[PDB]
Symmetry: D2
Subunit: 232 residues, 4 copies
């Protein structure tokens, strides 16, 4: 079982498994049931931006998701990730569809991690490439040539597939914490466009950090968001 | 009365005015009595590093101060600075001595602020100059040519003066928050060397943010750290 | 007489004063007649991006201007700016109109300077503010609230004024070179939209570096681009 | 045959194979015989810093190497790397010893590449780790726990081995050029300590860029610097 820490943009309420009963953003620490959630008005067909911010000092993992009309959800959760993550992780984006579906389109992704006492990794993808050799693609995720990362299967005619799951992880392992670093901080930002014409968009996109070998857990579509093998 | 938000490295306990009764780092929101403090073992003659981290999402202003042997104090305080600071501020470093004294030597200072929806300001001074035209010097603060910023008066023979106060503020106003920014974050880092041979080092160094016109408040040496006119 | 180094996006040929006889980008070292120019197809009403790159090692000041259809002009000029600029400068953007006119609209501006042996200044304005306290506005230049910097006068009805000149300089002096720095580098980027319906767009926008007190030289509209008092 | 572009800090004159007949820094484009060299006074046992700067606009690859007493060599070479490198490369550091030997100790390494029209990769290693999962180590190169990268074999007693070669490449492929990028720039910086007590230090350290699969070419010690299979 991979270790996962994730911010999820959860477009579909599986109130079954402790989602709230609206779309939400949530902070997931080793479980798809978020330790914390905030109501989130997904704007179908609109390009949102999620920011994810943590530092080892404040020990508060925060996320905001907003859209251009300014509507914003925020969630923060106090957690010492040193006690959750392995020292080295990969960072990634993950998305799933289920019985309902949506595009899970990432227009851009950036990430920074810093260990200060400085080691640092920053990458930014404002355009994705067809053969993006720094991105590890999993499940239905593809990139290129519209400059996008399609986390889940879209069809030839621009149509969000159901029953879909994919992720992209930055190629280089990140050293997310180092026990002598006085500050270990990361931030990530991604811009996304979730569009659906279905009866309910589902299921969402997550930014995640995981052990360096993480892969899509089996049957992790719809509600499990490609991050966890199950709903515990 | 200037508006001040500050992280203070407070080397001397004025338990009189609610210091704890040890040296401490503290978070000051509009008052020299810190909303929050942490015990701090000042290492005389050793070069410490303070990091200060805030973002409008987590709304938690955090500071750590460490030294090379790894000893560290941290303090964090939950505060929405949008409700404390003016939209535009200057950022600065401040230090004072009183009846006791110390060097308040800044070897480096860096700062970053970002407003994302990005506007950003980053500066870094790993060496200060004699005529440092981007730094507004106040009170006893001088820079150049040892590459240092002497926040307070030192004497020709390397001797920390008593009864001393100075600050350096970055020349450009910073736009610390902007009501449409989805994330307003700042961080600052400075490295310092507080040395004294006196009976007690005093009084400390602060990183502060203030209205753009802030100046040293009158008689703000020793305990008031050059930040506030008084101890309320 | 201010010292000026500039990259000019020169929309109008004053073949009179050694412009080439097409619009051009040029590198200006202390003179409006560029030491170097490249043909430039200004795309009326289109948002272009200029990048300006120099480092004290290669001693080559380079500029490219491009537009989204990919059309690009480049100009580079080998120059040791240590021998041209004062150690401290301000950096700015400048634009003018003459008998012909255009919008000189800056949508974004970023700048970085670094002195390594590191001191560094980076700012980025992806949105300008009405009361932009880190930007020194000169001549007709205004900012806010469309998020733009209007270097020259526009009229209430969106109309580019003739006979116009303005600039914006970053508030903080920059330390552009330091004789012990092993590398002194800067880069700047700005995005602009030059639009005109006139018979000929004129006259252009420049990014410039100048002594810290630089102001618009008298009658520096049209061809002189707000940078020089005359055409020598 | 790997494609290599490298800046070499060449401590030993193999005037045999067109080294100049002093230690030098050189720019290597697909050949160990530098297209360009500059005399370089290696300071035995002193910690030098090399900066490497290229951008697709100026098309000038520049390097300076300096030491703290200020002594500096520079070399620049005009080259359009788009025509030399594959679109995706790895970036690395390489070092060798021969009949003579030296420490090839890297204290820090940073790299940035940017494709603007922005994609970007920046990493910085100011401390290396024992199990540095973002660094691909080759030949004798080891890292950890003194915080250093030992490109070549050192012996238990701090002794630079002869006949040694190693490299470290950043784990993630870098996208060094992209035919729509208006500016493709990179820079790299590393700090190193070359120490020897031998009759002549040899042979040097290079920063290099190569195809993503590059490995040490066979018998690439001493003069070939771990970069090329031979001296053509
Ligand atoms: N509404 C729902 N809640 C929880 N789990 C589900 N799996 C499928 N539909 C679900
Ligand atoms: N110990 C102390 N506590 C508080 N204020 C003081 N002013 C001078 N000495 C002091
Ligand atoms: N065509 C032109 N060339 C040079 N200077 C000018 N001033 C006005 N028009 C001009
Ligand atoms: N001096 C030298 N010059 C060139 N190649 C060599 N190989 C070994 N020694 C050499
Ligand atoms: Ca769900
Ligand atoms: Ca005190
Ligand atoms: Ca002209
Ligand atoms: Ca050699
Ligand atoms: Mn959920
Ligand atoms: Mn205190
Ligand atoms: Mn011209
Ligand atoms: Mn050589």
């Amino acid at each position: 079982a991979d270790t996962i820490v994730a911010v999820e943009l959860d477009t579909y309420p599986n109130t079954d498994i402790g989602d709230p009963s609206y779309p939400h953003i949530g902070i997931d620490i080793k479980s798809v049931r978020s330790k914390k959630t905030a109501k989130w008005n997904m704007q179908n067909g609109k390009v949102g931006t999620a920011h994810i911010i943590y530092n080892s000092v404040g020990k508060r993992l925060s996320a905001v998701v907003s859209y251009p009309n300014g509507d914003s959800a925020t969630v923060s959760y106090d957690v010492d990730l040193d006690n959750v993550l392995p020292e080295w992780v990969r960072v990634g984006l993950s998305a799933s569809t289920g019985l309902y579906k949506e595009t899970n389109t990432i227009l851009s992704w950036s990430f920074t991690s810093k260990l200060k006492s400085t080691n640092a990794l920053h990458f930014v993808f404002n355009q994705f490439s067809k053969d993006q050799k720094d991105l590890i693609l999993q499940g239905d995720a593809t990139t290129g040539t519209d400059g996008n990362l399609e986390l889940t299967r879209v069809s030839s005619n621009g149509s969000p597939q159901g029953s879909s799951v994919g992720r992209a992880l930055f190629y280089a392992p990140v050293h997310i914490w180092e026990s002598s670093a006085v500050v270990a901080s990361f931030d990530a930002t991604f811009t996304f466009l979730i569009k659906s014409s279905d009866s309910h968009p589902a299921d969402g996109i997550a930014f995640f950090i995981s052990n360096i070998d993480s892969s899509i857990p089996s049957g992790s579509t719809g509600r499990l968001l490609g991050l966890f093998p199950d709903a515990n």
